[PDB]
Design a protein around this ligand. Structure first.
Ligand SMILES: Nc1ncnc2c1ncn2[C@@H]1O[C@H](COP(=O)(O)OP(=O)(O)OP(=O)(O)O)[C@@H](O)[C@H]1O
Ligand SMILES: [Mg+2]
Lengths: 50, 199, 29, 279, 233, 49, 119, 49, 114, 50, 50
């Protein structure tokens, strides 16, 4: 995810369902958009396995 | 379901997809509206009975397909908005029991400057170390439990002065870990950087 | 990595009125 | 939400019971401390009387009676409680100590800290001010031995060793049950007071020199006893305030829990009748 | 929307109270035979709020600023109407009974109110740092509320007692003599430029004003007025 | 409503009126009763919207 | 009422317990299919309690006084049953075990008990 | 009720009886189920009148 | 006591008593501070803080939650260890030494590690 | 004054301003206290409040 | 005993009667305790409470 607090304490693995649950304006969409953005390097590989 | 199908077409072709649902509580509200307009007798909190189904039927399609089926996968990051910081409400708990783990972003931690506001005590990833590169697993295997004990000890000893040396050392280590885990928005770290930081 | 951490820590800069009296029992000195 | 409210009601009830017990214990210890303060009064009166006589016969040249020509250091003995739950006791004492420090600095003197009680140590440590020597564990129940130790330390520091050209004691006067006041007394150098209207062994000078340290010791002991009495009075006041606040909190939380109980019943009825009306 | 789409004017659109929209829709629903939602509101609550709110959005080249009072019924911020309308708002100011009863007008609850432009990329690093330090102090003050209520500030640690003092001062300094409040209190209203408030809160969080009495900061609206009223006290 | 009608008649004629409603929570209770007897689904605290 | 209006006698009507009158009303309302009020009580709670209480009043010089034991659910004086009941009760006598154990019959708690005529 | 009848037979014959209902809460739940399945109107906690 | 034996019942009930007392005292500690408790209550709080953590265990199925392998504690050793804890034989070790250890030998090894 | 009464109900002493406010508020409260069925005219109210 | 339970910590500062009541109450509570499936006849209860 690019976020230490998740990749270290609550790791998200391919096939996992990680529920970002919280109150209004607590950083949920920020976490999800960060996860999406952090996949750019994997995309630029050109390998479907990555 | 449109997003899930778009992801599944790639998933069954042997490609990895990441599905964000923002927010599944608004799907539950929409289904409640549809059910009540069709005059299905509602269940609890005016929700239909099928509300749990609504989510499982969805979130249970995010799977890691076996090598026989292509080896594709679909990772779900459903987002749920809780009322008054109550993780123990109906829909939150339904989606919790359907999902492999939590990231409980708590506003109290957010305002304390603990961003991204992961409440370590309530959060958990039942995939755990199996979803971490071996270096990350060895460096941060016990990190979550250590931080949870740090928070517990902080709450217990906020007003104590007879702290032993070991307890003080644990408090210092936990505070430094919490500062280490703070991270600004749009500042992602590669996994190597993360393992060095947690090291 | 431990060696690098130590060499970096070497160069790292850290941010860190009443008056008490004796009554002499005589009126003048 | 109702579970949280009921848990908080139980917690507030326990706190109320503990605070009420502390209030009653403080009421007992206030009487004990006041009786102990009165028990030491005869010694203070008699020693003051004979000290006045000796001064009438003495040369009045003892260092405790003469100011240093250029004063730089002024020790301050801040008497504070060693346990919390005393309301503004420690805050009042330390605010008066800060006032004394400002007065000293405006006069060109440098204050050096002697402290009694852990709370004062904490307050001064947070403010990066060092303490030459500090004693603890007897503000709740002082004994003459602790006062003797404090007096010996202060007097020796006055005779000096970097030493101090002055020394004050900042502590809580127990004027009455309802009122206590943080005050500062300059315990040395002592004013020689002349007022309008015997035999001595071995001589008036040696006897007076041996008496003055004892007079300072007994005065510091009286200061400690009044500090304990004021600490217990402030504990009673603060614990009664805490009990009243806990009772108000219990009332508010009971009202909230009842609102939530009624809301839960109404909402369950609404869900049931919504199901029933739709058949 | 005629003024926006056709005339191309910058438009201010004030609603008071846009809760009364949903409430109206509730009554109609009860009469239209639609089955009740969670707490009696119409099933289409979110749909109606969406049809109303997403019309207020600003088209690309042509802007419509909007501001809406939202009556939260029974001071219950979890009521479905406020919860639904929260998702439609770029900036939210949650007024509270607690801050109101302390005399701290506009009674904005600092911790619950938020904006989507309180972001270091948009408002700058200094503004963001000051705002987030103020929020940290106020949240720490909120965390201590039970201990404050029972035992008072006396029992706290010094690192927290100083924080409580400057938290009270920040909370009262966030009050301002609004110009609309002249008709109620008589004092003319003051306007604080952004630079002055940023500097004032940077100074106040750092503790440079923790020697002044609390009342000095109450309904004073600025640093110059702060010093003037401190002299007054 | 009848009290306010009596008052309004004077009000529109130029007279000044003072209407006391003692007490409106008992009117809300009565309206709740009527609505529940008409079977209108209730909202918060059993009151209709 | 007969003892008052016809025999011309003062009467003292005990009710033990008037919460149970309200609860019987609620049960009957549920049996008849009428939709419950706030806390499950009947919609006509106020009307029924008024019809029972308003008849207890003085007329033509004679009076019907009433002592009504009031069970308060969950020790809640804000609950609709006691809330409706206590709008009619003019006085309150509270018998306490603390007073009774000290030998002080009638056992009235001088402090908890109160009256609206002590004016 | 079966236990109460068995006890009542002894009670009226001059014998002393002790009846233990373990538990009446489940008696009430069973009655609630029966009543709701029979479409009898529900009240508080869905129990019949 | 007729099934699990006298010692097991006594130790279990003492652990329950200590934990219940600690749960009651948590409300007091959260505000008035531990230092204000009774000395007996303070020792009991320490014993409870060690017992709560000693009831923890590194499970085999939880290997991937913690990294370390699982552990098994025979019933006799569990009874003996909790008897010692409730009697105060382990009050000197740090509380953190009782977390995720799974036994008495593991307790000693982790105490040495700290 | 009502806010200050809670603080002064247990504080041993307070500034001169606090004591002045407490006394003024107590006197004002006793002044506003009024019997029943005894409505004062507006001028009498003006003088009493003055 | 239930009112005095808060004073177990400060037993050293109570009156003689209060300490006697607290000590009696602790033992009465221990007396009311009883093991399972072992009822006591009324005579045994009388002697025990005696
Ligand atoms: N890690 C972070 N560091 C700094 N700022 C952050 C971080 N995460 C979130 N924020 C900021 O906090 C606020 C949270 O916005 P965000 O969109 O993440 O919230 P949300 O949980 O999706 O809320 P909602 O959907 O209810 O609007 C925004 O200002 C975002 O910029
Ligand atoms: Mg979002």
């Amino acid at each position: 995810t690019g976020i230490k607090a998740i990749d270290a304490m609550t790791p998200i693995g391919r096939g996992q369902r990680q529920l970002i649950i919280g109150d209004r304006k607590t950083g949920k969409t920020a976490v999800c958009v960060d996860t999406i953005l952090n996949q750019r390097e994997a995309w630029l590989t050109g390998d479907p396995k990555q | 379901y449109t997003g899930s199908a778009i992801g599944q077409h790639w998933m069954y072709n042997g490609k990895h997809v990441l599905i964000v649902f923002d927010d599944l509580s608004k799907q539950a509200d929409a289904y409640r509206a549809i059910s009540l307009l069709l005059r299905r007798p509602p269940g609890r909190e005016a929700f239909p009975g099928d509300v749990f189904y609504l989510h499982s039927r969805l979130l249970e399609r995010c799977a890691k397909l076996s090598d026989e089926l292509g080896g594709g996968s679909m990772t779900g990051l459903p987002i749920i908005e809780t009322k008054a910081n109550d993780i123990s409400a109906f829909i939150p708990t339904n989606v919790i029991s359907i999902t492999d783990g939590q990231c409980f972003l708590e506003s109290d931690l957010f305002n304390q400057g603990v961003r991204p506001a992961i409440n370590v005590g309530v959060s958990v990833s039942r995939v755990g170390g199996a979803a971490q590169i071996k270096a990350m697993k060895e460096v941060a295997g016990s990190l979550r439990l250590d931080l949870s004990q740090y928070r517990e000890l902080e709450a217990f000893a906020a007003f104590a002065s007879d702290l032993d040396a070991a307890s003080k050392a644990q408090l210092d280590r936990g505070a430094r870990l919490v500062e280490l885990l703070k991270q600004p928005q749009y500042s992602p770290l590669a996994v190597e950087e993360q393992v060095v930081a947690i090291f | 990595l431990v060696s690098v951490i130590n060499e970096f820590k070497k160069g790292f800069q850290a941010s860190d009125l009443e008056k008490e009296s004796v009554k002499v029992r005589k009126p003048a000195p | 939400t109702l579970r949280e409210l009921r848990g908080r009601i139980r917690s507030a009830g326990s706190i109320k019971k503990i605070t009420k017990a502390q209030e009653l214990i403080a009421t007992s210890r206030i009487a004990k401390a006041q009786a102990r303060v009165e028990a030491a009064r005869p010694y203070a009166a008699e020693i003051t009387n004979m000290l006045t006589e000796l001064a009438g016969a003495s040369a009045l040249d003892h260092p405790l009676l003469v100011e240093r020509k250029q004063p730089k250091r002024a020790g301050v003995l801040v008497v504070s409680s060693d346990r919390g739950l005393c309301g503004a006791y420690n805050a009042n004492v330390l605010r008066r100590a800060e006032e004394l420090f400002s007065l000293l600095r405006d006069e060109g003197k440098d204050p050096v800290l002697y402290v009694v009680g852990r709370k004062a140590l904490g307050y001064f440590s947070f403010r990066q001010r060092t303490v030459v020597e500090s004693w603890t564990g007897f503000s709740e129940r002082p004994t003459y031995e602790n006062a003797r130790e404090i007096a010996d330390t202060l007097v020796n520091a006055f005779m000096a060793i970097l030493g101090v050209d002055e020394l004050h004691i900042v502590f809580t006067e127990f004027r009455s049950m309802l009122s206590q006041t943080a005050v500062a007394r300059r315990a040395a150098p002592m004013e020689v007071e002349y007022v309008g209207e015997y035999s001595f062994e071995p001589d008036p000078e040696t006897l007076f020199d041996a008496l003055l340290p004892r007079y300072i010791a007994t005065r510091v002991y009286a200061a400690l006893l009044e500090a304990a009495a004021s600490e217990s009075a402030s504990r009673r006041r603060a614990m009664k305030s805490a009990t009243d606040n806990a009772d108000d909190l219990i009332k508010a939380l009971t009202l909230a829990a009842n609102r939530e109980r009624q809301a839960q019943i109404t909402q369950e009825i609404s869900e049931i009748v919504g199901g029933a009306n739709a058949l | 929307e005629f003024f926006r789409d056709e005339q191309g004017q910058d438009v201010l659109l004030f609603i008071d109270n846009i809760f009364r929209f949903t409430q109206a829709g509730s009554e109609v629903s009860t009469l239209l035979g639609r089955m009740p939602s969670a707490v009696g509101y119409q099933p289409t609550l979110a749909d109606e709020m969406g049809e109303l709110q997403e019309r207020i959005t600003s088209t690309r080249g042509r802007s419509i600023t909007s501001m809406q009072a939202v009556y939260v019924p029974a001071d219950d911020y979890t009521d479905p109407a406020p919860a639904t309308t929260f998702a439609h708002l770029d900036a939210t100011t949650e007024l509270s009974r607690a801050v109101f009863s302390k005399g701290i007008f506009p009674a904005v609850d600092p911790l619950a109110s938020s904006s989507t432009i309180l972001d270091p990329a948009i408002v700058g690093d200094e503004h963001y740092r000051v705002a987030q330090e103020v929020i940290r102090i106020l949240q720490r003050y909120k965390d201590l509320q039970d201990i404050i209520a029972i035992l008072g500030i006396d029992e706290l640690s010094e690192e927290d007692k100083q924080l409580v003092n400057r938290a009270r001062r920040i909370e009262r300094f966030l009050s301002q003599n609004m110009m609309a409040a002249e008709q109620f209190t008589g004092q003319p209203g003051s306007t604080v430029p952004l630079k002055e408030t940023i500097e004032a809160f940077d100074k106040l969080t750092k503790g440079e004003f923790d020697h002044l009495p609390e009342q000095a900061f109450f309904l004073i609206g600025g640093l110059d007025d702060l010093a003037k009223k401190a002299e007054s006290l």
